[PDB]
Structure formats: C-alpha cells, structure tokens
Amino acid sequence: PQITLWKRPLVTIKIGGQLKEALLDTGADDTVIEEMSLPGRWKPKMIGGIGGFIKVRQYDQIIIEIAGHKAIGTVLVGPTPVNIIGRNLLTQIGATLNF
Amino acid sequence: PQITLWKRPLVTIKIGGQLKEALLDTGADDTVIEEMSLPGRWKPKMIGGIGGFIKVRQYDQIIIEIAGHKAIGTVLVGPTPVNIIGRNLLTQIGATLNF
Ligand SMILES: COc1ccc2c(c1)COC/C=C/CCCCN(C[C@@H](O)[C@H](Cc1ccccc1)NC(=O)O[C@H]1CO[C@H]3OCC[C@H]31)S2(=O)=O
Ligand SMILES: [Cl-]
Ligand SMILES: [Cl-]
Ligand SMILES: [Cl-]
Ligand SMILES: [Cl-]
Ligand SMILES: [Cl-]
Ligand code: NA
Numbered sequence A, B: 001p002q003i004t005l006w007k008r009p010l011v012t013i014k015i016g017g018q019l020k021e022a023l024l025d026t027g028a029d030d031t032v033i034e035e036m037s038l039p040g041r042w043k044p045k046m047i048g049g050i051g052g053f054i055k056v057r058q059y060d061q062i063i064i065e066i067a068g069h070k071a072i073g074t075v076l077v078g079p080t081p082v083n084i085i086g087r088n089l090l091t092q093i094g095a096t097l098n099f
Helices: B087-093
Strands: A010-015 A018-024 A043-049 A052-066 A069-077 A096-098 B010-015 B018-024 B031-033 B043-049 B052-066 B069-077 B096-098
Touching: B052 B087, B069 B087
Parallel strands: B031 B069
Antiparallel strands: A010 A018, A010 A052, A043 A052, A052 A069, A096 B096, B010 B018, B010 B052, B043 B052, B052 B069
C-alpha cells in the first residue's frame, strides 16, 4: 500500500498466533511490543526513547506478520506505550518513505 | 525521493534560521526539536514516549524547510535526544510509507 500520515500508521500484526495493532515507526531502530510471552531465550537490551532509557527483553528470530507481510527477526518486549514496528522489520516488508 | 530504511532517515532541516539534522518519524504525532529559541507565543505541554514524559514548549505556526520542502505547523521544543519531524509536518511535504 501507500500509507498517508494524516492518521497514525497503525496496522495489524500477528505474533504467536495472536492479532495485535502496531505503529509503523520509521523513527524507531527497533521493534518494541507490549508485555507478552515469546518462545526461546532472551538477552538484555536498553533503549533510549524520548523520555529516557528502559530495559527490555530481546528475543531474536521471532516470526511476525505485519500488514500481511511475513517477517522473522528481533522483537523487544517491554513497557512501551504503543506497539511499534521499527526499521529492523520495516526493511523486511520492503517499506520505504517517499515524497 | 525514495528513502530506504536500512539507516535512520535523517534529513537536513532549516528552522528558526538554523540548519539541523532531523529524523523523518512516522511514529511521532508531532515534531519535536532540541532546545532552541523560536519567536512568538508558546504554551507548555507534556509528551510521553518510551522512557516516560518530557515537558516541551509548544510553538504554533512555525515554518520549517524539510529536505528543501517548506511546511508550516506546530513545533514542540524540549529535551528530546534527537530532532524529530513528526506526522503533522510529514503530511505537508506529501510523505507516504510504501510497501
Ligand atoms: C506528540 O508528539 C510526539 C512525538 C514523538 C513521540 C511521541 C509524541 C510520543 O508518542 C506516543 C507514542 C509512543 C510510542 C513510540 C515512541 C514514539 N516516538 C517517536 C519514535 O519514533 C521515537 C523517536 C526517537 C528516536 C531516538 C530517540 C528518542 C526518540 N523512537 C523510539 O523510541 O525508538 C526507540 C525504539 O528503537 C530505538 O531506536 C530509536 C530509539 C529507540 S516519541 O518520540 O515518543
Ligand atoms: Cl502472550
Ligand atoms: Cl531483526
Ligand atoms: Cl537558539
Ligand atoms: Cl500542526
Ligand atoms: Cl495526501
Ligand atoms: Na506562533
């Protein structure tokens, strides 16, 4: 699609068989999702957002569908105000910015 | 242009007579610039991202030039770690997300 920005670019994602809503976020290096269970081991990660730094759980090689496009990559889990799809997975679905 | 997302989508902006680098950020509702003075009236606001909230000054009707394209709208000024061009000005330069 071509998504304009007059409203938030929210899409449906599917992770662990569950549908969720997430924000396509070109200002995020990383994908960050609200507390949920994911398989496998996780590693520690700190991310610095507008308000300061938080701890998250980094799960690698997670299968996630984004607006009907399949991706497999790193998902950070932690107390983000909104689920966000960052550039690590926007590149996997072929997204670009255009003007 | 078409901007891929392998790297942060940074562009040069001109605001308040100053040249700065800023992130084209589809996950930001509004534009947030590091501390600087701007002319005119402002009012305080709180915005809440990863890491929590910061207090900013809201200036309305500010003209920016974004990668050579002029736009006018609200700019929030405050202790953001990165300058951000959010949706309120991305719409004005006709930016879309495409995949
Ligand atoms: C009202 O106008 C607003 C304007 C901006 C924001 C909000 C409201 C707050 O809007 C509420 C939404 C919050 C959820 C997502 C955060 C949205 N935000 C934009 C988002 O793109 C930030 C932009 C940024 C970039 C660098 C540093 C600070 C901030 N990126 C970010 O947090 O990414 C994290 C995950 O990947 C990592 O890579 C970059 C840092 C880290 S925000 O800054 O909190
Ligand atoms: Cl869960
Ligand atoms: Cl990844
Ligand atoms: Cl200044
Ligand atoms: Cl505006
Ligand atoms: Cl339009
Ligand atoms: Na003003």
